[PDB]
Design a protein around this motif. Structure first.
Motif, PDB file in Angstrom:
ATOM      1  N   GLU A   1     -24.992 -10.609 -59.832  1.00 30.11           N
ATOM      2  CA  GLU A   1     -24.343 -10.811 -58.542  1.00 30.11           C
ATOM      3  C   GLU A   1     -23.773 -12.217 -58.447  1.00 30.11           C
ATOM      4  OE1 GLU A   1     -27.114  -9.778 -55.431  1.00 30.11           O
ATOM      5  OE2 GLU A   1     -27.424  -7.813 -56.359  1.00 30.11           O
ATOM      6  N   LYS A   2     -24.534 -13.211 -58.907  1.00 33.15           N
ATOM      7  CA  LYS A   2     -24.051 -14.588 -58.863  1.00 33.15           C
ATOM      8  C   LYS A   2     -22.831 -14.781 -59.759  1.00 33.15           C
ATOM      9  CE  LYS A   2     -28.624 -16.594 -57.910  1.00 33.15           C
ATOM     10  NZ  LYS A   2     -28.550 -15.636 -56.774  1.00 33.15           N
ATOM     11  N   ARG A   3     -22.893 -14.281 -60.992  1.00 36.00           N
ATOM     12  CA  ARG A   3     -21.956 -14.691 -62.031  1.00 36.00           C
ATOM     13  C   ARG A   3     -20.778 -13.748 -62.232  1.00 36.00           C
ATOM     14  NH1 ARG A   3     -22.167 -18.164 -67.074  1.00 36.00           N
ATOM     15  NH2 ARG A   3     -20.049 -17.744 -66.313  1.00 36.00           N
ATOM     16  N   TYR A   4     -20.943 -12.455 -61.984  1.00 37.82           N
ATOM     17  CA  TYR A   4     -19.925 -11.475 -62.335  1.00 37.82           C
ATOM     18  C   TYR A   4     -18.763 -11.529 -61.355  1.00 37.82           C
ATOM     19  CZ  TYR A   4     -17.685  -6.930 -62.928  1.00 37.82           C
ATOM     20  OH  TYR A   4     -16.772  -5.922 -63.108  1.00 37.82           O
TER      21      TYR A   4
ATOM     22  N   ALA B   1     -21.610  -3.901 -63.181  1.00 34.01           N
ATOM     23  CA  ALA B   1     -22.506  -4.590 -64.092  1.00 34.01           C
ATOM     24  C   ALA B   1     -23.926  -4.337 -63.621  1.00 34.01           C
ATOM     25  CB  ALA B   1     -22.216  -6.090 -64.146  1.00 34.01           C
ATOM     26  N   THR B   2     -24.846  -4.251 -64.573  1.00 39.05           N
ATOM     27  CA  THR B   2     -26.228  -3.961 -64.224  1.00 39.05           C
ATOM     28  C   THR B   2     -27.152  -4.459 -65.318  1.00 39.05           C
ATOM     29  OG1 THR B   2     -27.781  -2.254 -63.499  1.00 39.05           O
ATOM     30  CG2 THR B   2     -26.298  -1.703 -65.302  1.00 39.05           C
ATOM     31  N   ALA B   3     -28.429  -4.542 -64.965  1.00 44.52           N
ATOM     32  CA  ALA B   3     -29.499  -4.812 -65.906  1.00 44.52           C
ATOM     33  C   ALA B   3     -30.631  -3.834 -65.647  1.00 44.52           C
ATOM     34  CB  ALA B   3     -30.011  -6.246 -65.783  1.00 44.52           C
TER      35      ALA B   3
ATOM     36  N   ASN C   1     -35.094  -0.603 -57.167  1.00 48.38           N
ATOM     37  CA  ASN C   1     -34.549   0.134 -58.298  1.00 48.38           C
ATOM     38  C   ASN C   1     -33.458   1.085 -57.827  1.00 48.38           C
ATOM     39  OD1 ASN C   1     -34.233   0.904 -60.929  1.00 48.38           O
ATOM     40  ND2 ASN C   1     -36.336   1.631 -61.209  1.00 48.38           N
ATOM     41  N   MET C   2     -32.270   0.946 -58.410  1.00 43.36           N
ATOM     42  CA  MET C   2     -31.165   1.811 -58.028  1.00 43.36           C
ATOM     43  C   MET C   2     -31.419   3.254 -58.429  1.00 43.36           C
ATOM     44  SD  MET C   2     -28.436   1.445 -56.331  1.00 43.36           S
ATOM     45  CE  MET C   2     -26.663   1.445 -56.205  1.00 43.36           C
ATOM     46  N   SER C   3     -32.170   3.487 -59.504  1.00 45.13           N
ATOM     47  CA  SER C   3     -32.472   4.858 -59.898  1.00 45.13           C
ATOM     48  C   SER C   3     -33.305   5.560 -58.833  1.00 45.13           C
ATOM     49  CB  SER C   3     -33.205   4.862 -61.236  1.00 45.13           C
ATOM     50  OG  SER C   3     -32.539   4.051 -62.184  1.00 45.13           O
ATOM     51  N   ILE C   4     -34.420   4.944 -58.435  1.00 51.35           N
ATOM     52  CA  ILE C   4     -35.253   5.534 -57.395  1.00 51.35           C
ATOM     53  C   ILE C   4     -34.490   5.599 -56.087  1.00 51.35           C
ATOM     54  CG2 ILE C   4     -37.359   5.282 -56.065  1.00 51.35           C
ATOM     55  CD1 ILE C   4     -38.175   3.580 -58.829  1.00 51.35           C
TER      56      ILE C   4
ATOM     57  N   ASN D   1     -25.907   4.480 -50.494  1.00 52.37           N
ATOM     58  CA  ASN D   1     -26.018   3.282 -51.317  1.00 52.37           C
ATOM     59  C   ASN D   1     -24.625   2.797 -51.673  1.00 52.37           C
ATOM     60  OD1 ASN D   1     -28.999   3.416 -51.600  1.00 52.37           O
ATOM     61  ND2 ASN D   1     -28.496   5.309 -52.692  1.00 52.37           N
ATOM     62  N   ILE D   2     -24.297   1.585 -51.235  1.00 52.73           N
ATOM     63  CA  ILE D   2     -22.941   1.063 -51.340  1.00 52.73           C
ATOM     64  C   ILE D   2     -22.976  -0.323 -51.972  1.00 52.73           C
ATOM     65  CG2 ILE D   2     -22.954   0.045 -49.039  1.00 52.73           C
ATOM     66  CD1 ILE D   2     -20.031   1.059 -48.792  1.00 52.73           C
ATOM     67  N   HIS D   3     -23.952  -0.557 -52.849  1.00 56.16           N
ATOM     68  CA  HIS D   3     -24.083  -1.836 -53.538  1.00 56.16           C
ATOM     69  C   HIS D   3     -22.732  -2.314 -54.054  1.00 56.16           C
ATOM     70  CE1 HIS D   3     -25.650  -5.122 -55.735  1.00 56.16           C
ATOM     71  NE2 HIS D   3     -26.858  -4.640 -55.958  1.00 56.16           N
ATOM     72  N   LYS D   4     -22.511  -3.628 -53.979  1.00 58.34           N
ATOM     73  CA  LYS D   4     -21.233  -4.201 -54.387  1.00 58.34           C
ATOM     74  C   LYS D   4     -21.010  -4.128 -55.891  1.00 58.34           C
ATOM     75  CE  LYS D   4     -20.883  -8.714 -54.693  1.00 58.34           C
ATOM     76  NZ  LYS D   4     -21.081  -8.910 -56.153  1.00 58.34           N
ATOM     77  N   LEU D   5     -22.075  -4.018 -56.682  1.00 62.93           N
ATOM     78  CA  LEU D   5     -21.943  -3.923 -58.129  1.00 62.93           C
ATOM     79  C   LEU D   5     -21.691  -2.499 -58.610  1.00 62.93           C
ATOM     80  CD1 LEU D   5     -24.608  -6.340 -59.662  1.00 62.93           C
ATOM     81  CD2 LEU D   5     -22.128  -6.534 -59.777  1.00 62.93           C
ATOM     82  N   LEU D   6     -21.785  -1.507 -57.732  1.00 63.09           N
ATOM     83  CA  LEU D   6     -21.436  -0.146 -58.108  1.00 63.09           C
ATOM     84  C   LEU D   6     -19.929   0.003 -58.231  1.00 63.09           C
ATOM     85  CD1 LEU D   6     -23.692   2.023 -55.806  1.00 63.09           C
ATOM     86  CD2 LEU D   6     -23.937   1.770 -58.275  1.00 63.09           C
TER      87      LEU D   6
END
Lengths: 245, 235, 233, 241, 237, 204, 258, 239, 152
Positions: free
Chosen positions: C174-177, C159-161, I144-147, G48-53
């Motif tokens: 991060e909080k809700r998903y 999920a992203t914005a 920013n994840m893109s950058i 980059n290992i973000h949890k939302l990825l």
């Protein structure tokens, strides 16, 4: 410098392209060419400047025949004017080859205006440095006269004047009942206006080039005959003396 | 002030000058001098070879080359541009022979090479700068011996005697002093070698020079060591 | 900073930056909020369609557009560039369909659209696409949500914005998903994430939402969006 | 940030296209203004008409063009650019009718023109020609339609819009007039457009210093109202206002 | 200037275009040439320079198709290019239409060709001014073309470095022309070159070239000893 | 005919959770035999075999170009090409050259990588896919192959039964075909095995 | 100023843009490779290992060029994708032409020639991506190569590109057995060097990806180790480190007694 | 200010960026080339490699054809490109005319290629120098040297790279007929020349020898060690 | 004193002159008798090679961030004047602070003390140090994840 006036493809921070304006400035530095649309024809007059006694008569004509029935009166860089005359001749030839009849002057003006706009769009080419007028007459469309400028606008006209003395020429044309005059008299009026606007102490030499396209030519543009031009010139000189008196 | 007018070959200066052509003509001077002399008995070419060090065998400095059996070229300037123009001259002479079945005149071959050289930025020829090489085509044709000089701007002209290269200004004066029309080929060779010895910082002996001649008769001949020593004996 | 090396796209700055593509990404971040959430049995895309006036007919130009019966796409950034990219994506999907008689996988469509963006970010006379795309597809038996950047880089997201308040949107997500989230709950999460960065009253006709389940991608009608907003509020 | 300003393809460090913004400034450079409004079953475009000379043929002077038999446009900005874009729109409509066999929808023609403009905004070959095109037509399934095609590829559809020097004032006036009974008739729409122009320009119109083009569901052919019709509208509606 | 004269594509903020003027200046770096015409002849007369007392004198009169010759002043590269173009055009006209190309049309072709560079950034304006002498069925013609792509139909003209002396002489004496024998016409041309010459210098057979065309006389170039009947007859100052 | 130049003969059949693709072995130019080990069945995957048959040049060219395309596709996708995707790929490959074709008639036979259900199809030289449920035949003696398959096929066969059926069909068709048939290779693809066999034949 | 174009020579003879690309490679995630007489292997860190990825793709840096070759990319993502596609195309073109897998050195040479052309020609910035190739060919068996943005490639027994490549290569130099290294020891060394080079707390298994190429039954097999195997290797390395620390503590206690 | 453009003359007449290509050549390791009666030999400095690095992929001596070899000094990638194009042209000249490429022809082609890249403005000069040593089809030990500017010469012995000037001066001083009277003294001379720049002398030396009709042979490191031992023995003896 | 710039419109010629005078004073004619100089810099790569030349700067001392043992030492130094509770492990805090400078460690102690001050306390505990570590070593990583993902 401004910093936005190089290349015709750059907008200044006002919405102005300055290269086109500089081209307009270039055209507003040349001799005066006027054209008046009488009821049954259109008459072009140009105050050609003999820049040396060596040039023979008829050198540097600024009145071109752009198709048989259409005349062109140019003002500005004469090289660009000749190139535009060639372009318009080719456009009229293509029209007659494709569709099979004489090109309407409104359409011819639109085509040449689009060409001039093409050259004002890009940065690899400079805008055309001249204005011009297209005049014609036909039974089914009537006398028409259009003016094209470096920016590429093709507004129709009843009387137009381009060059150094454009404002004065328009002022002297407003005082004419062109909508009900005939060619034989509007030619004399054209000669008179050109002589009045001509500056003798600044431009020195001078030659009046006249042309008409009208009913009395069967819609065929041509240079005004010798005798008619002579009589119009005599009338213009007499009128200059009268105005001085 | 020549910073907005000499950065390109298609930009005029307020005086109406092509400073890039000026600079190619200047690059001509960096080559070694070469003196050509036209005489009623033929044409002579004599060039200062500029051996930088031994171990470089002399037949790699091609200042004098052969164009067809009746023309020689004495070159001064960039070696690469020299090779390009020499190849053009050779191919043009052979093409003219192939088509018309005769020998191209020295003037015509110089004209063809000049025609190649004119095209700096003309966008229909691909070279982008003037050829920084100046050539002396000395040949023999139906008009008798002739010598032509071509420069980077493509301008060519015949020359009863000419000198190109580093010692051009200082050797053309000597050529003017010593040259007269009624001169024999041996006299021309002697005078050219005298001028070369005058204008060379090294001593004139055997190598460090080249000499060639095209006569109404025998083909373009490049003097070998024996002939070079024989002439140098009593230049 | 490296001031000289920021006007060209064919030169590395001394530190290795390609500054112009980062500026394109700044143009992206300065765009309308859009959110994408990959539910357990589907995907949802949302984006504010707030207009600058009441005169803008907010039913003519859409922001969440389909690309196939099983792929849809939203964006954050410039609308014209978005139009170009959606047309190219449709064309690429159709080419893939003609070659392989099979709907293009979402991963492949994302690869090819990223390749298009790369093509546009490799010369001096061309401007990189100033948009970020969020592609949502139902290839195979599982949902896919991908992001594509002007740089030609593409991501897979839970999920992203993106847009003006992407930082707040990502913290909220991060909080809700939670991974085992049904599509119906993901729609509420998407609309709430939008609300957290949506000024003014989030009326049903100034927000645009598109779902992607096993039945295929579909832009929810304004009546459905109104129902979801009423249920959320 | 002024370095990122001379090239259409350079992003400002904050991601802005200053040359596109300058194209909009160029829109606001012809001096004229244009307004467009759609009723229940008609659409109307009204443009300020300046003819500052007795020698200039008012018939040739105009900013209303017939893109096709059933689509009209009002152009505001540089005149050469306006006519070039008008020719492009006519060509695109003709191509659409040739390829697909039915008249081009107004929204489709707007999208085509907007894409053409976006191409110039992205590549560096031309300058983005600085004109704004407001298109009106009658769509068989949607009804009257008014659209804009600004010179950056943006083409949203409109209930009522304006372009030129006084676009902001006209927009505010039309917002106020559309918050209250947006449902307008033919006469009411012509009233609203003409009144918007008159109030924003701070002048009452002669029948000649204004040009109106109209499309209606009953008669879905772009018609340019004549001087008599313009005068009738002005007199009758000013009297009965 | 300094940013408005780098290329022909930029108008200066005065309605003035600078690289064309610079080419028109380049035309003055050549050598003096005077063209003139009677009612049945046309004569170009050129002052050939010399790069050294050994090198021959650069040719300045070139031979376009039999009824046309050209006198050049300016860049010799552009002179060669334009001469080749004119020769090709005349040959094409004589191939398609079995008649010589009219001079007034050849000059129009030259004008268009030379104007094209003066508007597009791909090349520089042809830095060469031309005096075109020709004889078509209308009559003898002298034309001048300048790097600006402008051409003038001149009854008598001069170009090159030190040109105004010859131009003033031509303005003073042109009333004599037309009703002149060929010898008198050539003598007037030689007088014009004498006027443009520095006082200490004089016209010698080495440095004078004389091209003549006219009725029953295909363009002939007289150089070296061919000019002796003209210079010898010419009166001395 | 162009096909009859090099001859050729290929067949495919399917039973329950298994397919069988068979092909003759011969390369003779027109009448003279050249070799007898010509590979006419190419493996495009674990459980997917193509059976190009026709002009030998085009058989090899199509095998190689199809393998090029398929390797690119598999590397780019990360998957293994499904039989329908392979059929579409071969149809596109063949129809890209309609105006001047590859003179070969592919016959694909395999198992779906996920559900492991049988698949068989055949294409003409311009790429007209024809998915069938019982059997496909390509190459010379297509009439003999059709007769054999018609009179010997029965739904829901097991590996060995299908082996016998396809074996008999190929043997009896090639023994009546002249330009083709110098041995028959049969590949039977199941959920976990490939049985490749080199049947006896009228080696003449 | 001698770095405004890729095709401009510095007055000393240096291509500053190519050097800029080479240095910029240092931003990429640390990838490394070890060659063992039993097989070859790569390891790579997930920057980059973000949890939302999501983890849609089985590998982010390690690609399979053909049957007998794989490569790890380090540098700009767009350039890396372009070059991976081009490598696959080159390998399959060679296979179509010759009917046998392209040798690893030939494939590396082809892609590096493409990179050299980019460094040499016109207005094209050099590919800002370094590559580590592993492969097996009939001529030299298991091979490991490294290729730069400048189109220069070398063959290595062990090497590292990306972040902290200097530390990783120094560690391999210290602790690599020139001719007596098996695949198990290679994996252990890879885990060690990654742990000491990542410099981010403990060696999270989800932040590392390892691939091994080995010959088996006459066919090359490229396996990206599953997270279970990676976790097991990390746990074994942690146990080894704890044992070493216990031994050092015991030595310290003995020294205290002395 | 008259720099950064490959096609812009400086007012002195210099095209500076090709000179910068030469200055880039100067940053390569020494490569010597000598020609004898029946032997042509190329020596090169190795510069050693990290023990983890492989060696066979580091090539400075490449055989372009059967009877032609090329030693390198400059940018490695340009080395590879020019070598590949030279090999293609060798085997294409073989097709055009049924005769093996002559050393002069192949070096002329390489020089023409470098000149082609120096001509335009959208290309960067090949910043390399090459020593082309070979045997003509008649049999003649030819040695040429090509520079980044596209100019090629014929030398009897020359060195290119870091130690170019010193090695070339030494060769000038110590190159003679008695020193190349046979097929082994030439090799002694090449190792002697290289030892003046390479400190180690045995681990920083590679020699490649071409004899008439014989394929290029690269001397083993043990043979190099034996030769350097011979030179050391002669030096100590004649001290 | 830093790398010298070409004398032009965009160069600090006067500061360059000041640095040149300093160079001459450090080592020119009439060498100094008993003057010793301690220069301090935060980035050394930009200093002029003339300054960094030996004889002017004879020795160059690097100050790497503490290696967890220097961090334990700094924690002890800055917690000596503090009422640490029993069972408090400055070694654990040092481990929790990787790559942290001595200023960071002093700030950790100060912020734990501030946490104690907040709750009208004169007492510091392990929780206080851990919260101080969290509050002080707060990183503003890329947004920013893109950058962030431009580079692989």
């Amino acid at each position: 410098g401004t910093g936005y006036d190089l290349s015709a493809s750059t907008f200044s921070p006002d919405g102005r392209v300055f290269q086109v304006e500089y081209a307009m400035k270039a055209v507003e530095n040349s001799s005066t060419a006027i054209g008046i649309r009488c009821k049954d024809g259109v008459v072009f007059g140009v105050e050609k400047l003999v820049l040396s006694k060596l040039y023979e008569e008829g050198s540097n004509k600024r009145l071109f025949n752009v198709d048989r029935h259409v005349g062109m009166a140019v003002a500005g860089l004469l090289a660009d004017a000749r190139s535009l005359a060639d372009i318009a001749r080719e456009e009229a030839s293509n029209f007659r080859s494709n569709f099979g009849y004489n090109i309407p002057l409104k359409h011819l003006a639109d085509r040449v205006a689009m060409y001039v706009h093409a050259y004002t769009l890009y940065s690899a080419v400079r805008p055309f440095g001249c204005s011009f007028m297209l005049g014609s007459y036909s039974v089914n469309d009537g006398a028409q006269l259009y003016m094209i400028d470096p920016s590429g606008v093709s507004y129709g006209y009843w009387g137009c004047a381009i060059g150094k003395a454009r404002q004065a020429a328009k002022t002297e044309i407003e005082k004419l009942q062109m909508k009900e005059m005939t060619c034989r008299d509007i030619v004399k009026e054209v000669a008179k206006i050109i002589y009045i606007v001509h500056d003798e102490v600044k431009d020195k030499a001078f030659e009046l080039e006249l042309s008409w396209v009208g009913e009395l030519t069967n819609g065929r543009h041509e240079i005004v005959p010798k005798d008619i031009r002579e009589e119009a010139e005599k009338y213009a000189k007499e009128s200059l003396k009268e105005e001085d008196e | 002030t020549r910073s907005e007018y000499d950065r390109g070959v298609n930009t005029f200066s307020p005086e109406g000058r092509l400073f890039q052509v000026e600079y190619a003509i200047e690059a001509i001077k960096l080559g070694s001098t070469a003196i050509g002399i036209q005489t009623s008995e033929g044409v002579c070419l004599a060039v200062e070879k500029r051996i930088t060090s031994p171990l470089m065998e002399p037949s790699s400095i091609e200042k004098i080359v052969e164009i067809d059996a009746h023309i020689g070229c004495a070159m001064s300037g960039l070696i690469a541009d020299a090779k390009t123009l020499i190849d053009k001259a050779r191919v043009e002479t052979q093409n003219h022979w192939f088509t018309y079945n005769e020998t191209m005149t020295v003037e015509s071959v110089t004209q063809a090479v000049s025609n190649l050289a004119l095209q700096f930025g003309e966008e229909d020829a691909a070279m982008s700068r003037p050829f920084g090489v100046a050539l002396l085509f000395g040949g023999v044709d139906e008009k008798g011996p002739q010598l032509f000089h071509m420069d980077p701007s493509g301008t060519f002209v015949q020359c009863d005697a000419r000198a190109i290269g580093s010692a051009s200004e200082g050797a053309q004066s000597s050529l003017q002093e010593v040259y007269h029309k009624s001169m024999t080929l041996k006299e021309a060779i002697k005078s050219s070698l005298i001028i070369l010895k005058q204008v060379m910082e090294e001593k004139l002996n055997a190598t460090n020079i080249e000499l060639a001649t095209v006569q109404p008769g025998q083909n373009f001949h490049m003097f070998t060591k024996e002939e070079l020593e024989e002439v140098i004996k009593d230049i | 900073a490296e001031r000289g090396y920021s006007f060209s796209l064919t030169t590395f700055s001394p530190s290795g930056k390609l500054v112009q593509i980062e500026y394109a990404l700044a143009a992206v971040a300065g765009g309308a909020p859009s959110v994408g959430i990959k539910a357990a049995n589907g995907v949802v895309l949302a984006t504010e369609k707030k207009q600058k006036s009441i005169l803008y007919d907010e039913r003519s130009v859409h922001k969440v557009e389909p690309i196939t019966k099983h792929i849809g796409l939203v964006y954050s950034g410039m609308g014209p560039d978005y139009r170009v990219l959606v047309h190219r994506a449709r064309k690429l999907a159709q080419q893939y369909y003609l070659v392989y008689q099979e709907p293009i996988p979402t991963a492949q469509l994302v690869q090819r659209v990223a390749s298009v963006m790369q093509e546009y970010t490799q010369s001096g006379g061309v401007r990189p696409f100033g948009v970020s795309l969020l592609i949502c597809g139902w290839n195979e038996g599982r949902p896919y949500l991908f992001q594509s950047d002007p740089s030609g880089a593409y991501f897979a997201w839970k999920a992203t914005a993106m847009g003006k308040n992407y930082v707040n949107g990502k913290t909220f997500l991060e909080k809700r998903y939670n991974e085992d989230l049904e599509l119906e709950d993901a729609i509420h999460t998407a609309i709430l994430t939008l609300k957290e960065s949506f000024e003014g009253q989030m009326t049903e006709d100034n927000i645009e939402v598109g779902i992607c389940n096993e039945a295929g991608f579909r832009r929810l009608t304004p009546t459905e969006v109104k129902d979801y907003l009423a249920a959320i509020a | 940030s002024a370095g990122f300003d001379r090239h259409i393809t350079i992003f400002s460090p904050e991601g802005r296209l200053y040359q596109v913004e300058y194209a909009f400034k160029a829109i606001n450079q012809g001096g004229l203004t244009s307004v467009a409004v759609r009723g229940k079953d008609c659409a109307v475009i009204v443009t300020q008409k300046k003819v500052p000379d007795k020698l200039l043929d008012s018939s040739t002077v105009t900013h209303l063009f017939k893109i096709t038999e059933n689509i009209g446009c009002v152009m505001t900005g540089m005149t050469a650019d306006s006519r070039s874009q008008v020719q492009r729109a006519r060509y695109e409509a003709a191509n659409w009718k040739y390829k697909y066999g039915y008249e081009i929808p107004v929204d489709m023609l707007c999208k085509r023109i907007a894409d053409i403009s976006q191409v110039y905004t992205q590549n560096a070959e031309m300058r983005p020609l600085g004109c704004c095109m407001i298109l009106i037509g009658i769509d068989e399934e949607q009804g009257p339609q008014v659209y804009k095609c600004d010179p950056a590829g943006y083409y949203c559809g409109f209930k009522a819009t304006a372009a030129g020097v006084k676009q902001t004032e006209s927009t505010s006036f039309l917002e106020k007039k559309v918050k209250k009974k947006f449902d307008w008739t033919f006469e009411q729409t012509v009233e609203t457009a003409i009144t918007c122009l008159s109030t924003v320009l701070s002048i009452d119109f002669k029948p000649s210093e204004i040009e109106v083009g109209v499309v209606t569901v009953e008669n879905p052919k772009f018609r340019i109202l004549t001087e008599a019709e313009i005068d009738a509208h002005l007199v009758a509606l000013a009297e009965r206002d | 200037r300094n940013q408005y004269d780098n290329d022909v594509t930029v108008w200066s903020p005065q309605g003035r275009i600078h690289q064309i003027e610079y080419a028109m200046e380049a035309v003055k770096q050549g050598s003096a040439t005077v063209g003139l015409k009677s009612k049945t002849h046309a004569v170009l007369v050129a002052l050939k320079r010399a790069q050294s007392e050994l090198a021959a004198h650069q040719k300045k009169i070139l031979h376009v198709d039999n009824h046309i010759g050209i006198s050049i002043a300016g860049l010799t590269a552009d002179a060669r290019l334009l001469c080749n173009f004119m020769r090709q055009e005349c040959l094409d006209s004589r191939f398609v239409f079995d008649r010589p190309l009219p001079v007034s049309r050849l000059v129009s072709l030259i004008g268009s060709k030379t104007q094209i560079p003066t508007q597009r950034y791909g090349r520089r304006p042809y830095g060469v001014g031309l005096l075109i002498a020709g004889y078509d069925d209308m009559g003898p013609h002298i034309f001048q073309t300048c790097p600006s792509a402008n051409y003038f139909d001149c009854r008598a003209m001069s170009i090159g470095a030190r040109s105004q002396s010859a131009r003033t002489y031509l303005e003073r004496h042109m009333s004599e022309f037309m009703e002149c024998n060929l010898n008198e016409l050539v003598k007037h041309g030689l007088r014009a070159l004498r006027e443009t010459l520095p006082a200490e210098q004089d016209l010698t057979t080495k440095n004078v070239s004389i091209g003549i065309v006219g009725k029953d006389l295909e363009f002939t170039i007289y150089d070296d000893d061919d000019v002796s009947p003209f210079l010898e007859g010419l009166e001395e100052r | 005919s162009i096909m009859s130049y090099n001859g050729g003969a290929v067949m495919a059949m399917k039973g329950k959770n298994c397919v069988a693709i068979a092909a003759d072995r011969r390369f003779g130019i027109q009448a003279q035999m050249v070799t007898t080990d010509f590979q006419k069945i190419f493996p495009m995957g674990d459980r997917l075999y193509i059976g190009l048959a026709g002009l030998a040049t085009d058989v090899q060219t199509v095998a190689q170009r199809l393998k090029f395309r398929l390797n690119l596709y598999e590397l780019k996708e990360g998957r293994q090409i499904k039989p329908y995707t392979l059929m579409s790929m071969v149809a596109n490959l063949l129809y890209e050259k309609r105006f001047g074709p590859y003179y070969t008639e592919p016959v694909i036979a395999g198992l779906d990588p996920k559900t492991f259900k049988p698949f068989i199809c055949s294409l003409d030289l311009i790429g007209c896919p024809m998915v069938t449920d019982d059997f496909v035949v390509s190459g010379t003696c297509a009439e003999q192959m059709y007769g054999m398959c018609e009179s010997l096929w029965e739904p829901n066969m097991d590996p060995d039964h299908l082996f016998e059926t396809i074996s008999q069909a190929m043997l009896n068709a090639v023994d009546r075909d002249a330009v083709s048939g110098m041995g028959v290779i049969v590949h039977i693809i199941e959920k976990d095995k490939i049985t490749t066999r080199t049947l006896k034949a009228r080696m003449d | 100023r001698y770095d405004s174009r890729t095709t401009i020579f510095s007055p000393e003879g240096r291509l500053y843009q190519v050097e800029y690309a080479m240095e910029a490679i240092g931003h990429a995630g640390t990838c490394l490779g070890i060659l063992a007489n039993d097989g070859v292997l790569l390891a790579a860190e997930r920057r980059n290992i973000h949890k939302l990825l999501d983890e849609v793709f089985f590998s982010e840096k390690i690609y399979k060029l053909n049957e007998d070759m794989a490569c790890s990319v380090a540098g700009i993502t767009s350039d890396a994708n372009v070059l991976t596609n081009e490598l696959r195309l080159i390998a399959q073109r060679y296979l179509l032409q010759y009917q046998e897998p392209i040798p690893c050195e030939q494939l590396v040479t082809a892609l590096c020639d493409i990179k050299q052309a980019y460094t040499q020609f016109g207005g094209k910035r050099p590919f800002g991506v370094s590559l580590l190739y592993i492969g097996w060919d009939k001529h030299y068996g298991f091979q490991l190569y490294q290729s730069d943005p400048s189109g220069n490639y070398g063959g290595w027994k062990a090497t590292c590109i990306g972040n902290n490549s200097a530390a990783a290569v120094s560690m391999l130099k210290q602790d690599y057995k020139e001719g007596e290294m098996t695949l198990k020891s290679a994996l252990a060394l890879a885990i060690k060097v990654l742990n000491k080079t990542m410099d981010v707390s403990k060696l999270s298994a989800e932040k590392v990806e390892i691939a091994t190429l080995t010959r088996e039954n006459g066919k090359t097999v490229i396996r990206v180790l599953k997270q279970k195997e990676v976790e097991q290797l990390i746990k074994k390395h942690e146990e080894e480190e704890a044992k070493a620390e216990r031994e050092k503590k015991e030595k310290e206690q003995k020294e205290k007694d002395k | 200010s008259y720099d950064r453009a490959i096609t812009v003359f400086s007012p002195d007449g210099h095209l500076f960026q090709v000179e910068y290509a030469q200055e880039a050549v100067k940053k390569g390791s020494t490569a010597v080339g000598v020609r004898g009666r029946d032997i042509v030999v190329l020596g090169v400095e190795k510069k050693s490699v990290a023990k983890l690095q492989d060696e066979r992929t580091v090539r400075k001596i490449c055989a372009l054809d059967d009877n032609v070899c090329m030693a390198f000094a400059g940018l490695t990638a340009d080395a590879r490109i020019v070598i590949n194009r030279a090999r293609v042209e060798c085997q294409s000249h073989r097709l055009t005319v049924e005769d093996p490429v002559t050393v002069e022809y192949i070096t002329r082609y390489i020089a023409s290629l470098k000149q082609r890249y120096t001509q335009s403005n959208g290309r960067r000069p090949f910043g390399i120098s090459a020593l082309i040593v070979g045997f003509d089809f008649d049999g003649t030990p030819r040695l040429y040297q090509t520079d980044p500017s596209g100019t090629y010469h014929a030398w009897k012995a020359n060195a290119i790279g870091r130690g170019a000037k010193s090695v070339r001066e030494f060769l000038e001083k110590n190159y003679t007929d008695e020193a190349i009277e046979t097929d082994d003294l030439t090799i002694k001379l090449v190792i002697k020349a290289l030892l003046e720049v390479v400190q180690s002398g045995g681990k920083n030396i590679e020699l490649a020898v071409m004899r008439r009709d014989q394929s290029l042979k690269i001397l083993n490191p043990e043979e190099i060690e034996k030769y350097v031992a011979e030179i050391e023995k002669e030096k100590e003896e004649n001290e | 004193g830093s790398s010298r710039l070409e004398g032009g419109s965009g160069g600090d010629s006067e500061v360059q002159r000041t640095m040149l005078e300093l160079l001459n004073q450090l080592d020119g004619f009439e060498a100094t008798k008993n003057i010793k100089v301690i220069m301090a810099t935060n980035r050394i790569d930009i200093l002029d090679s003339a300054l960094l030349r030996p004889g002017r700067i004879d020795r160059k001392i690097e100050f790497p961030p503490p290696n967890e043992e220097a961090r334990l030492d700094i924690l002890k130094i800055h917690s000596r004047k503090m009422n640490l509770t029993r069972g408090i492990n400055l070694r654990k805090i040092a481990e929790l602070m990787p790559g942290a400078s001595g200023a960071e460690v002093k700030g950790v102690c100060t912020e734990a003390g501030m946490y104690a001050l907040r709750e009208r306390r004169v007492h510091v505990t392990q929780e206080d140090f851990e919260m101080a570590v969290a509050k002080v070593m707060q990183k503003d990583s890329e947004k920013n994840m893109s950058i962030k993902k431009l580079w692989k």
